[PDB]
Amino acid sequence: GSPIKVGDIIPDVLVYEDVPSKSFPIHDVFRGRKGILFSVVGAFVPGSNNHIPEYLSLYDKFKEEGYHTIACIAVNDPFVMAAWGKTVDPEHKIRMLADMHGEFTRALGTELDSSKMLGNNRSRRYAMLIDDNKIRSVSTEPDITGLACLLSIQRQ
Amino acid sequence: PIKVGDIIPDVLVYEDVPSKSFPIHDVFRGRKGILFSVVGAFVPGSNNHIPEYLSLYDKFKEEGYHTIACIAVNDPFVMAAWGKTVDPEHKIRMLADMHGEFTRALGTELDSSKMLGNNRSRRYAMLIDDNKIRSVSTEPDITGLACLLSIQRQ
Numbered sequence: 001g002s003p004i005k006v007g008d009i010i011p012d013v014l015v016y017e018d019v020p021s022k023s024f025p026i027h028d029v030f031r032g033r034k035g036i037l038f039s040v041v042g043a044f045v046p047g048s049n050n051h052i053p054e055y056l057s058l059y060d061k062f063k064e065e066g067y068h069t070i071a072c073i074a075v076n077d078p079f080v081m082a083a084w085g086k087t088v089d090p091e092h093k094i095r096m097l098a099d100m101h102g103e104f105t106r107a108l109g110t111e112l113d114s115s116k117m118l119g120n121n122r123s124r125r126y127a128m129l130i131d132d133n134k135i136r137s138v139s140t141e142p143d144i145t146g147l148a149c150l151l152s153i154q155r156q
Numbered sequence: 157p158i159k160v161g162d163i164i165p166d167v168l169v170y171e172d173v174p175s176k177s178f179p180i181h182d183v184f185r186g187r188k189g190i191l192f193s194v195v196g197a198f199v200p201g202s203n204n205h206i207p208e209y210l211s212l213y214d215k216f217k218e219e220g221y222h223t224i225a226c227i228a229v230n231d232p233f234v235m236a237a238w239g240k241t242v243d244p245e246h247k248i249r250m251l252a253d254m255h256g257e258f259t260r261a262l263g264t265e266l267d268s269s270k271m272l273g274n275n276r277s278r279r280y281a282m283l284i285d286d287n288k289i290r291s292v293s294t295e296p297d298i299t300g301l302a303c304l305l306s307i308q309r310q
Contacts, residue, residue, distance in 0.1 A: 077199075
């Protein structure tokens with residue numbers, strides 16, 4: 001995947017949620033609306049819950065601006081992803097998207113060289129603002145906090 | 157496939173964190189134990205039998221089978237977190253065959269890439285004595301009770 005860029009349409013690939021039989025194009029999540037898409041290296045991987053608490057705390061602020069649709073994506077199977085999501089987000093404010101084959105991550109160009117540590121290649125951390133499947137803003141470490149996310153929204 | 161009397165594959169597995177790895181032979185060296193697989197942490201069915209093993213744990217110990225290990229093709233962070241939810245007292249060793257190396261060597265790989273992203277392990281339960289297989293069982297004979305009965309047939 002080439003360097004991501006504002007104005008680009010996100011890769012139109014299938015992701016999974018809850019169970020392997022429930023898959024759908026990621027475009028379904030952001031079609032006709034604004035939202036936030038951010039990644040973690042993996043469910044239960046240290047660091048994966050570093051930012052979720054701030055996203056959750058800012059939910060009504062995101063919602064004020066039409067960004068109540070928030071999705072977390074990781075290269076995991078959906079059983080693991082869903083179980084993890086319930087532990088970090090009991091009110092289910094965040095859609096937990098399992099990029100199970102790493103297809104979205106590869107298409108986006110955000111593969112991590114993590115096979116030695118985790119068995120396969122996971123995603124690097126990013127956070128993006130999306131509008132009808134187009135990228136409005138892109139951030140990477142260290143600008144991947146909840147706050148970082150809100151300020152970008154407000155600049156609009 | 158796997159046969160009684162064969163030695164289990166001498167490969168690394170992981171436990172808790174990626175930096176904690178060891179030959180799986182360390183788990184059963186010089187002792188009796190139980191090794192059983194699940195398709196994955198949090199996969200439906202993966203907690204069908206753990207409650208049975210835990211209920212029979214003291215009986216297994218009376219029989220000299222103190223070492224009980226669950227193995228899955230998962231990273232160790234996920235495996236350990238899952239283990240804590242199904243076995244909070246940590247009676248069972250939770251082994252992460254993260255690369256699927258043990259599973260492939262044993263010949264128990266499942267064609268599961270479309271359902272789960274990669275190839276996982278078929279379900280089995282084995283009795284081990286100093287890394288030698290003394291009994292092997294596959295579905296549906298992978299309950300706690302089946303394990304106890306296998307032990308008592310030894």
